C-alpha cells in the first residue's frame, strides 16, 4: 500500500508541474502563486532524483553506478513528498542512488560552499 500511495503522489506532483511549466516558460517562474512555487521546487527535486547512474554506463557517466533497493526507493520518495528535505539543495538529488547518497552529496556541496565563503570572507 505504501508503494502504491507514494507512486500516485509522485505522479500527481509531476502532472501538476507540467501544467505549471507552460506558464513558467512564457511569463516566468516568479509570476506564480507562492503555493505553486513549493510544488515546483519539490517537482524539480523529484525529476532530478529520478535520475540514476547505471553500472553499465560508468564510461558515459564517469561515476560509479548504484543499485537501489525498492524499500529505499519508497522511503526516500515518501520523505521527499512530506517536505523534510526542502532545505537540501536541488542538485544534491542529481545522479545519485538512495536518500543516503543525496545527503552525502549535499554534505560535500555544503563543505565546498563553506570553503568558498571562507575564501571570500578572508579576502576582506
Amino acid at each position: 500500500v505504501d508503494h502504491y500511495n507514494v507512486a500516485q503522489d509522485v505522479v500527481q506532483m509531476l502532472t501538476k508541474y507540467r501544467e505549471l511549466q507552460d506558464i513558467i516558460a512564457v511569463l516566468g517562474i516568479d509570476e506564480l502563486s507562492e503555493e505553486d512555487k513549493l510544488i515546483v521546487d519539490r517537482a524539480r527535486k523529484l525529476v532530478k532524483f529520478l535520475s540514476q547512474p547505471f553500472q553499465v554506463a560508468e564510461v558515459f557517466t564517469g561515476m560509479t553506478g548504484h543499485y537501489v533497493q525498492l524499500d529505499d526507493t519508497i522511503d526516500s520518495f515518501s520523505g521527499l513528498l512530506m517536505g523534510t528535505y526542502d532545505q537540501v539543495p536541488e542538485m544534491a538529488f542529481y545522479m545519485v542512488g538512495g536518500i543516503n547518497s543525496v545527503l552525502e552529496k549535499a554534505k560535500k556541496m555544503a563543505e565546498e560552499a563553506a570553503e568558498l565563503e571562507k575564501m571570500r570572507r578572508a579576502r576582506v
Binding site: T84, Y85, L103, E104, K107, A110, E117
Partner: peptide, 30 residues
C-alpha cells in the same frame, strides 16, 4: 505521573540530515 510508576538505519538518515543542516547554517553565519 502514574505512567512513570510502571513504565537504527533511520537514525543514520537523521544524523546526516542534521549535519547537512548544521553546515548550511554555519556557512550563513560567516
Amino acid at each position: 505521573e502514574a505512567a512513570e510508576r510502571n513504565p537504527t538505519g533511520d537514525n543514520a538518515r537523521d544524523r546526516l540530515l542534521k549535519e547537512v543542516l548544521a553546515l548550511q547554517a554555519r556557512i550563513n553565519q560567516r
